[PDB]
Structures are given as structure tokens and as C-alpha cells.
Nucleic acid binder design. Structure first.
Length: 960
DNA sequence: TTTGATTTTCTGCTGCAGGATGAAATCCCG
DNA sequence: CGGGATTTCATCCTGCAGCATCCCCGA
RNA sequence: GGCGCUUUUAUCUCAUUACUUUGAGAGCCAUCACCAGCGACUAUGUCGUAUGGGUAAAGCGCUUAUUUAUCGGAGAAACCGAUAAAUAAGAAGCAUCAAAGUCCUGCAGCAGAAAAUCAAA
């Protein structure tokens, strides 16, 4: 039996309970609002229910729509105002958003600055730096840099972060007094959206307090990103400046003329970023055109320059809402293309004989292109021209007329058909793509004749037409729908947002979420005896800051025109988790409601094959009781080898290191190897291939395939976490992850983001572990991953590039052929090497000795040491691939013993073995030696090998 | 015979940062 | 007066160390 | 690629709600040339292509009546008991079980896809 909540119940039972911390673990519940569509779906059941709930009233829906619209307008207005202010003065704004220290840090300041890092804007006076050194629990001291003015009204403790020349450190959302400047009537600011946008209809307090943090979070995040990147840009500039001289030196070494353009300094806007990147791109283009190709120079001798990447933007106001109509762009294309009839006509009708053959070169398709199921419209146009030439001879005056007429007919038919389809309700994706492609082909055929006469005019037309082509191709899949949100700061009587329910002597309670934001609405509260429940009365509870729970009664009327009433809909599992759980009771106070939102968003429906706006309610819950982890002590161990071909391979061993035959294979025999998450890559590749095949046809995949990959990946990671946690808890053990840097993954050519699932698995497993209050260091740990995939299990030797160099020097030719030895073990040089360097794309293999004999053609007596750098690079490469320990991803071969086994399993066992080693004593002795500056990793390799075969001799009896 | 640079556009998925407000004070206000 | 309705404000804490670890490559 | 069946529950020692998903579970249906795209050419078009937009499909059975032929009244003749099929209708158990869910706001980076510009292999 594998059920996650069963494991949670066992973990709860076998431990004690205690209260949570200041801010306990948090979890979010997402349900749906009762809409008449759900009612109709419920009424179509084969077994109709007896008590069908009532849907939302028409009165509340208009209130929700109006209030969400006003909310969006107000947020946009505030963002616009602050965008203008930032565009006026950056430094002032970023100095206005700083987060001061809590007003309890009044310990005696000891050393002031020995000074003008920043300045508070109220008095426009520079802030002076003050330091303080503290010793923590672990004894490591750190110094805090603070900013304080000389004016008593401005003597705050704004924190600073030093640099090796200072930075702010933290931007808070509640630092700025938003309410007193943009809501209250005393302020004379010209922008009062509640007074202006809202029409003086909504309550001031809650709406203003919500809008405050909603804007402040975004602006603080943007400013933090800007302050973080301002230093990385400086580092990139200083690094890239030196490289220019090296490129200049290499180009000048052959008398190359290099363009004279300078590098602008560090920009503080987005336009200077664009100019600097344009300069860098120009330099890179010149280098590629002149150095790498013509002079056959490698990239590492003349390394390329870098760009300035990652520059942020101010929220929501720099988004270019390129709202254009499809037919308008079509009309522009048709009007502009019709202008250039006569010039192209003259050009084609007044050409010579053999220049025509080279002119129509882009109009012939290769045989490889021809066979691939379909050819492009341009090539089809070229074939049409070829047919006209074969039909009518050399009379090229009339051929342009015939081509123009035929393309006119084709475009006219496409336009008529497209218009006719989208008249009623139909939308065709493929037809629009075909029309755009034919328009592009016609444009190219017309404009080819001006590519040399006037380049400036021709280039402007090129940019115009390519922008038009891109927009025409991308519009029929552009998404215009955007979310709409409604914050609710907190669930207390202050904010006037009720979550109420009723009682019948048991937890069976009817749900309702009530919002009172408009003026004139009535909604009261009444304090009651804790157990004075009455029939047909709605109840609720109000949490207290001190930790008391107040059973608090709510009374109101369902017919109030200024109220909003929301009934919810969910499942039994959700209710058992949050609403009426048995261990965590919001009635008692073990669970506390924090806040929530109201979300309307897109959703796919298979019945209509469309996306329709639907309402959602997100509620956040914070736990107030956690478990104790003082009574836990795992003994056994499991290693995990994360990857893409197999998302999870696990192996279990005892503390002694002996594998445990406690898992049943597909044949029912005991073993120590399991594979979780298999066959997932095939589903992902199927989804991706469907996306590609639909993208080739019409330029984009319909909304049916929009979110399949994310859902499948999330299911994989959640089930994998459940399985791993089950295997841990039921076997009395502890997991061992490999130490991998965050965001690790392969960035290549056939890579997709759905498969980068290492950090996601680790984070999810930590989250599900920490929800019960346990530290991640108890049921989880990470250790070194070095040499884990290079270590043999039978002989223990780890292959190193240093060994390759040693073995290569020994190799020579004998009567039997080329031979070599390793540690007294003779090797035979007779093999074949397979590989796949795209391009030709066919199975090609190479002989080993013959190529080595062929390599011996350019040398006498096969003196390998005398070979040049270029030909020696081939020499070790051939031996590296033929003697590789991983010729195939799932198959491993050893060199010193020739062992054959699955690759991941051995590495998985080596993970646990390494985790055991790192807490052994041989590691300590290595630490003592290396402290003297001997940063020789080969000593670590030697220590690894020595410790490994020391242990293998007695406890690790090899499998036979 | 595809390729490595650059340009145009559309998409989705991940990796960062922010945060998950109630208490106390006035000011009314019929 | 009592009960809303708008108005400020401020807030506890300090993972424990070595260079690959899932990558894959011409006639 | 779709069509009717929905469970299991992760709380067996105790209860609610329908939500968003994942898939491993039987049975059945994917035909038109109305419009477009495409390939080959007798070529300002003709044929095939079902590649897209539309248009019919998608469960057992009994019960009820009708229609074709048969065993039934030898008769084959109404009326049906049944035999095989088709038409129409309503109850009918539904042929279907097994697991998960922390949100949102804003940015940036990657890869997917066609198209445009230079040179070399």
C-alpha cells in the first residue's frame, strides 16, 4: 500500500506535537465558484442528486465585474505615476524604497565611518555609515553597515551592503506610506484613483490597503533586480574590454582592416543597452566574417565578446500592446507590393542570357528538399516559372504578366475563402499561413530586382515587409486575454471580508464567502458564547494576534444590492485536507486562515473547443502546530541518481555498505535496485512532436496542447516524491541526494524546459517534508558527486584524463599490431568507433588500427611524441571514444577489469558509498594535509581510490 | 551541404524576487 | 454617546566545503 | 482522433461538494468532395490527395410496436413465440478501475517553429 496521507498519519502518530513558530508552514487551496454551468453539469448525472445547490445570483456578478475593472484601472494609474517618477530620478526613487531596520536595534553604536554612500530624500543630506560586529550561535562574526542621518527626524537605521562601493540590501513593500499619499483626503497629489476611477463608490480602507502592497511588491522587485544587475554589467564590461585588444592584435597580425567603433559606457536605461548590444553584435559579425572562416582560426584563440543580458523593465507600462488588425496589415502588404510592378517587369524583361540562370538560383529546390513531403511556395513559384519557360520559349516579356495573373488569382481565392470562413464562426489557421507565405513569395519575386540599384530604399522596404510578415504570421495565435485579481489583505473584522458557515451539531457545515467592499452594504458581527450555536445561523471564527480564537457570529441579508455572495465547490479530499480535517481544526485554532484572492482566468473546455473566462477562489492556510524531530534516527541509506533517460534510480544499502535485497523486481526476486518515473521521456517527446507537426502546418499549436507538458511533468515529480518518501519511511532509512548547483541542466540544441526536473524534485520533497515541521537536514541530505559515475564496483578504478596521457605515450606498433599496457595489464588495439556529427546524417564507422596505421603514414617509426598539435588531437580522441567507460548511456564498461553492467545503478550505489565516505576518518587526514596550500585534486583521487579498495577488501565482497 | 553569426515573430517552461495585516488612533455622527 | 469609518505603523531570526555531477557529435 | 460507464479513495474504526489533473479499465465509430492547401501534367485549368473548416458516426440486452425472408396455422394468410436484419421509443444495471493537487504579481533567460542577409566545407 502506497498512499501519501497514510505516511503523513504514521509520521504524526509516531511523534509528539508542539506549537509552530512565528510564521508556520503555509499551504494554498484553490477551488471554483459555483456557476450555473456547474449546476447544469451536475443535473446531467445518471443518478441525479437530491439537494442541488443554488448558483450565484445575477446581482453579485455585475458587482464583481465592475469592481475588478476599477481595481485594474487604479493599479495601472498608480504604476504609470511611479513610472514617470522613476524616469525623472532613479536614485531618488531607489533611495525612497529602502527598508529600515526594526525600531528596537538601539544597541550602542561603536564605530562610525572612518561616508557618503547614500542619502535620505527628506532632508537631502548624505547618510553616514555605522558598523557593528556580532557573534552568532556558530561563532562566525559578520559586520552590518547602516545608514543614519544627522537630523533627529531622519535618524533611521537604513541597512547597507558593502562591496570590495556600497549597496542598499533590502527593499520592503510597507516602507513607503502609500495610504497617506494616495488615498487619504489630506493629500494633494493629483492622482486619487479611488476618488477618480472608482467614482467614490467603494470603501477606502481595505481597497487602498490592498492596492498599496499590490503596487509596492512589483516596484520593489523591479528595483531589487536593477540594483542587482548594475554590478554584473560592470563586471561584464571590464571583462569584455580586454578581449577587444586580443581580437585587434590577432586581426592586425595579418594586416586586417578593422572598423573603428568605440564601446559606450555602462547604460542606465534600456536604449543604451540596445546600442551597446548592437556594437557587440557588429563586432561579432565582423569577427565571424573575417577571422574564423576566411583565416580558419579557432574560437578559443580569438574568443567572442559578450552581451549585456537580463536588464529588467518597469512593471506593466513598458509592455508593447501591439494591437493591430490582420486585414489592415494584409491591405498594407497588397498596396505596397502593387507599387513595384513596372521596375520588376523592366528588370526581368531586360536581362541578358546566362545571368538569368544564376538569377533564378534561389528558385530551384534540392533533391533532398523535393522528397520531404512538401515544398515551399517560393520553390513552387520557381517551378511555375520553369513551366512557363518550357511552354513559351524565351519570350520573357509576357511571362511576368502570366505569373502576376496566376498569383493574383491564388491570393484572391485565398482571401475569398478566408473571409467566408471567418464570417460566421469559423477560424482557419492553415489558410492564413498559406496566404502569408504566398504573399512573401510574391514580394520577394517583385523586389529581387532592386537589391543593387538603391540599397537604402531596398533595405527600408525589407524591414517593412519582414515586420509585416512576422506580425501576420504571429497574430492568429496572439493571446489577448489577461488575468484579473482581487486582493483580500486579511480575514478580520477590520477588513470587512467574511468567510462564514453554519452548524448542525456536527462539522457538516455549509460554505459561503462574503465580500463587502461597496459603500452602503451592511454586514455585522456579534460576539457569542463559544458553544451557543443555533440553527439557521451562520457562524465563523476570528483569530487573535495573541493566539486566542474568538467564535464570532455574523448576521446579514441575502438581498442586499451592495453585497457579494460566493458559494464554493470542491471535492472530498480538499475538504478533509483543509475544511473539516480531523487533526487540524480551524475551530480549535490549530489551523489559521491567512488571506486569499479572487481570480478569473482562462480555462479550456473540450465541448466547445475554446477557452472561456472562469472564476476561481484561492485561499491560503497557515499551520499553527508542527511535529518534533528529536526522536528520529534513520539507519539505512538510499542513493538516487537523477537524470533524463531515467528520472529516478534508487539503491538501498545498510550502514555497513552491503546492498539490501528488500525490493521485488519485475520477476519477483529480491534486489536493491528500483526505477521510478520510467517511460516519461516518451510521452514528453510525443507531446513535443505533436506540437512541432502542428506548428509546421500553421505556425502554432492550438490551446488543446497548451499545458499538457506542464501537467505531465508535475504529475511525475509529485508521484516521484511520494514514492521516494514512502520507500524512506517504510524502510527506516535516509535519502542521499547528489550535490548539484541550482538550475543545473544541459543547454544544447534538442533540449526542452520540461525535462529540467532536478531542483523541482528536491524542492518538492523538501516542501512535503517541511509541512509537518521537520528540518530538511533530518530526512534528507546532500553529498559530493565527484567521480561517482567514473568508479568501478568490481575493481574500483576511476578513469582519469591523466591516465589517457600516460597510456598514449606507451602505445607503439608491433608485429601483432599496436599494443599498450596499463599497470602491467596488456591491451589490444583492435576496435571500431561509431558517432553522429549531424550534417551528413548517416551511420558511419571507422577502423581503429587502419586509421592508426593511416596516422602512421605521416610519421617515421611511429614516434608519437614528435607529432604536431593538430594531428595529436586526433590521436587521443580516437582512443578516448574507443576506450570510453560510457560508450552508451545505459551501458558501462570498465577498462582495468572489463566489467559490464547498467550505468546508473553503479553510480547510484557509489552515491551512497560517497556519502558514507565523507563522514569517515580518512577524509579528515586529507583535510589536514591540504591546508598547506596543496590544492592537488589528484590527492583527492588517490584518497578516494585508497579508501574505496580498502573497504572493498573485507565488507564489499564483489558480486559473482 | 548544412553551418555559424545577425534580424523578425509567435509560443511554453523554468529561475529569480515579493509576500500570504492586525493593532492602535482619531474622527466622526446621526 | 457606541459603532462605524478612515488613518498610521511596524515586525524575531544567522546552510557549514570540493571541482562533475545525465550526456550523447562524419563520408 | 473521438463516443455513452464512472469508481477507488488516499479518515474503518467513521462520514458531506460536484473542483483541477494523471493513466495503465471493456465495447463502438472515424465516412463526404461542399470550400481551401497540395503533387503530376494534356496547364489562366484537369485528376488524385480527405492535409485543414464544415457536415453522419459512435454500448449490451430485453419491452413495445412496424418492415424483409424463415421455423411457426400444414400456409408461406393478419397476429405475433422464435429465427436473422433494419426502423422508432422509454425505464433498465451499465459493460470502469487506480493515484495526486502552494498560490498569485512582475521580470529575465532558454528551447520549439518558419522567413531574411555573408563565406567556407
Amino acid at each position: 500500500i502506497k498512499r501519501i496521507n497514510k505516511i503523513r498519519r504514521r509520521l504524526v502518530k509516531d511523534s509528539n506535537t508542539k506549537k509552530a513558530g512565528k510564521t508556520g508552514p503555509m499551504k494554498t487551496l484553490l477551488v471554483r465558484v459555483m456557476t450555473p454551468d456547474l449546476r447544469e453539469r451536475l443535473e446531467n448525472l445518471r443518478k441525479k442528486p437530491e439537494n442541488i445547490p443554488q448558483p450565484i445570483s445575477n446581482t453579485s456578478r455585475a458587482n464583481l465585474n465592475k469592481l475588478l475593472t476599477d481595481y485594474t484601472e487604479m493599479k495601472k494609474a498608480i504604476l504609470h505615476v511611479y513610472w514617470e517618477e522613476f524616469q525623472k530620478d532613479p536614485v531618488g526613487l531607489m533611495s525612497r524604497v529602502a527598508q529600515p531596520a526594526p525600531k528596537n536595534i538601539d544597541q550602542r553604536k561603536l564605530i562610525p565611518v572612518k561616508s557618503s554612500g547614500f542619502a535620505c530624500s527628506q532632508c537631502c543630506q548624505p547618510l553616514y555609515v555605522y558598523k557593528l560586529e556580532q557573534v552568532n550561535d556558530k561563532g562566525k562574526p559578520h559586520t552590518n553597515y547602516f545608514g543614519r542621518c544627522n537630523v533627529s527626524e531622519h535618524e533611521r537605521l537604513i541597512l547597507l551592503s558593502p562591496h570590495k562601493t556600497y549597496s542598499l540590501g533590502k527593499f520592503g513593500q510597507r516602507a513607503l506610506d502609500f495610504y497617506s499619499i494616495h488615498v487619504t483626503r489630506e493629500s494633494n497629489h493629483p492622482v486619487k484613483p479611488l476618488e477618480q476611477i472608482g467614482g467614490n463608490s467603494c470603501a477606502s480602507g481595505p481597497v487602498g490597503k490592498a492596492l498599496s502592497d499590490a503596487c509596492m511588491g512589483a516596484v520593489a522587485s523591479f528595483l531589487t533586480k536593477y540594483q542587482d544587475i548594475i554590478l554584473e554589467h560592470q563586471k561584464v564590461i571590464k571583462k569584455n574590454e580586454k578581449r577587444l585588444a586580443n581580437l585587434k592584435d590577432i586581426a592586425s597580425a595579418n594586416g586586417l582592416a578593422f572598423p573603428k567603433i568605440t564601446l559606450p559606457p555602462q547604460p542606465h536605461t534600456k536604449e543604451g543597452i540596445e546600442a551597446y548590444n548592437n556594437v557587440v553584435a557588429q563586432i561579432v559579425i565582423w569577427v565571424n566574417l573575417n577571422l574564423w572562416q576566411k583565416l580558419k582560426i579557432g574560437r578559443d584563440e580569438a574568443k567572442p565578446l559578450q552581451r549585456l543580458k537580463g536588464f529588467p523593465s518597469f512593471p506593466l507600462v513598458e509592455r508593447q500592446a501591439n494591437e493591430v488588425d490582420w486585414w489592415d496589415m494584409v491591405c498594407n502588404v497588397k498596396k505596397l507590393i502593387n507599387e513595384k510592378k513596372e521596375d520588376g517587369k523592366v528588370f526581368w524583361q531586360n536581362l541578358a542570357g546566362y545571368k538569368r540562370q544564376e538569377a533564378l538560383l534561389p528558385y530551384l529546390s534540392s533533391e533532398e528538399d523535393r522528397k520531404k513531403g512538401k515544398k515551399f511556395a517560393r520553390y513552387q513559384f520557381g517551378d511555375l516559372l520553369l513551366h512557363l519557360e518550357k511552354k513559351h520559349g524565351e519570350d520573357w516579356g509576357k511571362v511576368y504578366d502570366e505569373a502576376w495573373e496566376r498569383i493574383d488569382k491564388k491570393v484572391e481565392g485565398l482571401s475569398k475563402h478566408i473571409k467566408l470562413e471567418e464570417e460566421r464562426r469559423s477560424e482557419d489557421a492553415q489558410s492564413k499561413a498559406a496566404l502569408t507565405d504566398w504573399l512573401r513569395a510574391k514580394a520577394s519575386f517583385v523586389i529581387e530586382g532592386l537589391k543593387e540599384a538603391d540599397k537604402d530604399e531596398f533595405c527600408r522596404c525589407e524591414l517593412k515587409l519582414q515586420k509585416w510578415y512576422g506580425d501576420l504570421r504571429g497574430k492568429p495565435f496572439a493571446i489577448e486575454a489577461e488575468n484579473s485579481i482581487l486582493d483580500i489583505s486579511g480575514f478580520s473584522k477590520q477588513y470587512n471580508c467574511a468567510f462564514i458557515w453554519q452548524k448542525d451539531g456536527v462539522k457538516k457545515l455549509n460554505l459561503y464567502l462574503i465580500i463587502n467592499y461597496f459603500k452602503g452594504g451592511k454586514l455585522r458581527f456579534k460576539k457569542i458564547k463559544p458553544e451557543a450555536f443555533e440553527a439557521n445561523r451562520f457562524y465563523t471564527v476570528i483569530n487573535k494576534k495573541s493566539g486566542e480564537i474568538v467564535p464570532m457570529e455574523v448576521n446579514f441579508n441575502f438581498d442586499d444590492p451592495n453585497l457579494i455572495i460566493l458559494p464554493l465547490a470542491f471535492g472530498k479530499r480538499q475538504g478533509r485536507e483543509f475544511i473539516w480535517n480531523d487533526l487540524l481544526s480551524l475551530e480549535t485554532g490549530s489551523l489559521k486562515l491567512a488571506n486569499g484572492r479572487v481570480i478569473e482566468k482562462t480555462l479550456y473546455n473540450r465541448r466547445t473547443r475554446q477557452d472561456e473566462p472562469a472564476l476561481f477562489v484561492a485561499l491560503t492556510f497557515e499551520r499553527r502546530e508542527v511535529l518534533d524531530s528529536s526522536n528520529i534516527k534513520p539507519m539505512n541509506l538510499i542513493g538516487i541518481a537523477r537524470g533524463e533517460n531515467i528520472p529516478a534510480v534508487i539503491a538501498l544499502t545498510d550502514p555497513e555498505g552491503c546492498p539490501l535485497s528488500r525490493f521485488k523486481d519485475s520477476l519477483g526476486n529480491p534486489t536493491h535496485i528500483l526505477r521510478i518515473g520510467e517511460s516519461y521521456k516518451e510521452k514528453q517527446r510525443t507531446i513535443q512532436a505533436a506540437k512541432e507537426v502542428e506548428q509546421r502546418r500553421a505556425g502554432g499549436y492550438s490551446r488543446k496542447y497548451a499545458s499538457k507538458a506542464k501537467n505531465l511533468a508535475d504529475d511525475m515529480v509529485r508521484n516521484t516524491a511520494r514514492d521516494l518518501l514512502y520507500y524512506a519511511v517504510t524502510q527506516d532509512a535516509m535519502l542521499i541526494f547528489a550535490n548539484l548547483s541550482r538550475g543545473f541542466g544541459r543547454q544544447g540544441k534538442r533540449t526542452f524546459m520540461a525535462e529540467r526536473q532536478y531542483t523541482r524534485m528536491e524542492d518538492w520533497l523538501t516542501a512535503k517534508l517541511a509541512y509537518e515541521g521537520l528540518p530538511s537536514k533530518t530526512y534528507l541530505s546532500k553529498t559530493l558527486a565527484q567521480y561517482t559515475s567514473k568508479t568501478c564496483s568490481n575493481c574500483g578504478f576511476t578513469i582519469t584524463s591523466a591516465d589517457y596521457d600516460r597510456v598514449l605515450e606507451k602505445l607503439k606498433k608491433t608485429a601483432t599490431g599496436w599494443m599498450t599496457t596499463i599497470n602491467g595489464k596488456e591491451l589490444k588495439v583492435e576496435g571500431q568507433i561509431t558517432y553522429y556529427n549531424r550534417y551528413k546524417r548517416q551511420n558511419v564507422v571507422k577502423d581503429l588500427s587502419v586509421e592508426l596505421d593511416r596516422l602512421s603514414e605521416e610519421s617515421v617509426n611511429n614516434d608519437i611524441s614528435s607529432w604536431t598539435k593538430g594531428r595529436s588531437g586526433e590521436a587521443l580522441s580516437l582512443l578516448k571514444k574507443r576506450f570510453s567507460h560510457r560508450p552508451v548511456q545505459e551501458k558501462f564498461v570498465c577498462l582495468n577489469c572489463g566489467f559490464e553492467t547498467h550505468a546508473a545503478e553503479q553510480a547510484a550505489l557509489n552515491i551512497a558509498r560517497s556519502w558514507l565516505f565523507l563522514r569517515s576518518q580518512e577524509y579528515k587526514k586529507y583535510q589536514t594535509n591540504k591546508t598547506t596550500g596543496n590544492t592537488d585534486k589528484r590527492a583527492f583521487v588517490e584518497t578516494w581510490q585508497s579508501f574505496y579498495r580498502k573497504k572493498l577488501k573485507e565488507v564489499w565482497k564483489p558480486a559473482v
